From TrEMBL, chains A, B:
Keywords: Transferase
SUPFAM superfamilies from the UniProt entry: Phosphoenolpyruvate/pyruvate domain
GO MF annotation terms: carboxyvinyl-carboxyphosphonate phosphorylmutase activity
Organism: Corynebacterium glutamicum (strain ATCC 13032 / DSM 20300 / JCM 1318 / BCRC 11384 / CCUG 27702 / LMG 3730 / NBRC 12168 / NCIMB 10025 / NRRL B-2784 / 534)
Domain of life, source organism: Bacteria
Top EC class for this record: transferase
Keyword Ligase: no
CDD domains registered for this protein in UniProt: ICL_PEPM
Protein name (database record): PEP phosphonomutase and related enzymes
Pfam families, per database record: PEP_mutase
Entries under InterPro entries matching the protein: ICL/PEPM, Pyrv/PenolPyrv_kinase-like_dom, Pyrv_kinase-like_dom_sf
Coiled coil: none
Enzyme Commission number, as recorded: 2.7.8.23
Length: 255, 255
């Protein structure tokens, strides 16, 4: 019958188009993945930082891509909900190669950012990045899978040292990434309601914010976020970090 | 290399002989391992159940042993404190091969239990199990390393359906394992102060109890366990399980 892969991708893509706020908690292993499925979420994300910290490596494409894909494959085997994987800047792979690998690993979404770790953290030009996303969308289309390509820009995080007006750059970049065929966009580093509103209003696809699982997001509480029109919430490294802090405090009772 | 490993083992063994109450938190990856070292503990344990659940497998020797030793290797590389690994019933290896492999992975302690998962969960005879422990001690001795062999018995956990008086059996088994050269013993499944005290009193090596990082043990909290003479405390699957419960609760806010 139908590949599970294509079914999961269609569901994930449909959910992104629905207009609902999608919470896609960010996992790092089959244990954390299982917890997300058991909790009733409709999909999940895999964080590169927390996977790297849990597998003897570090963020910034220090992991071996093949080793990382092996972790993804275990996660996608362990759950029956759609899985998206943060592939950083693409690990020096062509967009078509990148898509082939994530599909082989059973994932139906990716994040791709504009800081190129294999090139000294060079910041891609806005159109150069949109073109990378466009080529990834082309490859997904050719493969016949509704991969949710979440186009990430680091513009706000890079800040005034890189861009005269980082918010104007972020808006430009998410518009271009939408035009390139991204089914979600992820302008990281936001802290205010005004930033969020401006970015939500610039595109017709979901805008992703990063939340702490207890502390939320700087722009406001979850009801405020929904009211601002935020359509994707992920945790990045902050679920793992929260567990770490919780553990550290509790271990003081033992030594 | 071997000098560092021998030094780690000697420190771990000396700590066991000292009389100190040793808390050795039970980890399942490099992330958890790091937290233990950061928190100031003098060694740690690797739990077979939580590793399996985090790597797409399950407890009871369903993991591939080579794949498990790869996780152990990452962990011993990530920390500079002694590491002990739960190797279940030995994965059908000879005691000498088992010791060879745990040393190659950088560990300086093991737990070995008497339910033989590769033989339909047959329970070893009491001397048969002691003999396995003795052969492992002999192999460590030949290797020149003070490996802390923590001899586990499942007698109390198996209970009266298997051993009509499971405490008599457990006491017998921990005494035989000490005679065989175990540097610690681990009669799992305990829930009362009466049980803990009588096992503590039966041997001159540490007795290991399993504690929940919040809820302690059936027999009491740390101070109470210490007063009963307990000298080794580990978490088994319970640190991971607590993080799971904590996570499951917090995830409800996002669902
Ligand atoms: Cl980060």
């Amino acid at each position: 019958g139908m590949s599970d892969l294509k079914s999961l991708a269609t569901k994930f893509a449909s959910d992104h188009e629905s207009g609902k706020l999608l919470v896609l908690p960010t996992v790092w292993d089959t244990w954390s993945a299982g917890l997300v499925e058991e909790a009733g979420f409709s999909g999940l994300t895999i964080g590169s930082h927390p996977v790297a910290d849990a597998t003897g490596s570090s963020d910034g494409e220090n992991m071996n891509f093949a080793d990382y894909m092996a972790v993804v494959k275990k996660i996608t085997s362990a759950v029956s909900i759609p899985v998206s994987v943060d592939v950083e800047s693409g690990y020096g792979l062509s967009p078509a190669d990148l898509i082939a690998q994530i599909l082989e690993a059973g994932a139906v979404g990716i994040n791709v950012e504009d800081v190129v770790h294999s090139e000294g953290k060079r910041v891609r030009e806005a159109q150069e990045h949109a073109d990378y996303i466009a080529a990834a969308r082309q490859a997904a289309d050719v493969a016949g899978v509704d991969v949710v390509i979440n186009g990430r820009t680091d513009a706000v995080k890079l800040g005034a040292d890189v861009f005269e007006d980082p918010m104007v750059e972020a808006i430009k970049r998410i518009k271009l990434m939408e035009q390139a065929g991204a089914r979600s966009v992820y302008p990281v580093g936001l802290s205010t309601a005004e930033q969020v509103e401006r970015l939500v209003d610039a595109v017709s696809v979901p805008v992703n914010i990063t939340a702490h699982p207890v502390d939320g997001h700087g722009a406001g509480d979850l009801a405020t976020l929904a009211g601002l029109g935020v359509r994707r919430v992920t945790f990045g490294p902050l679920w793992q970090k929260w567990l770490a802090a919780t553990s550290a405090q509790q271990l003081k009772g033992w030594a």
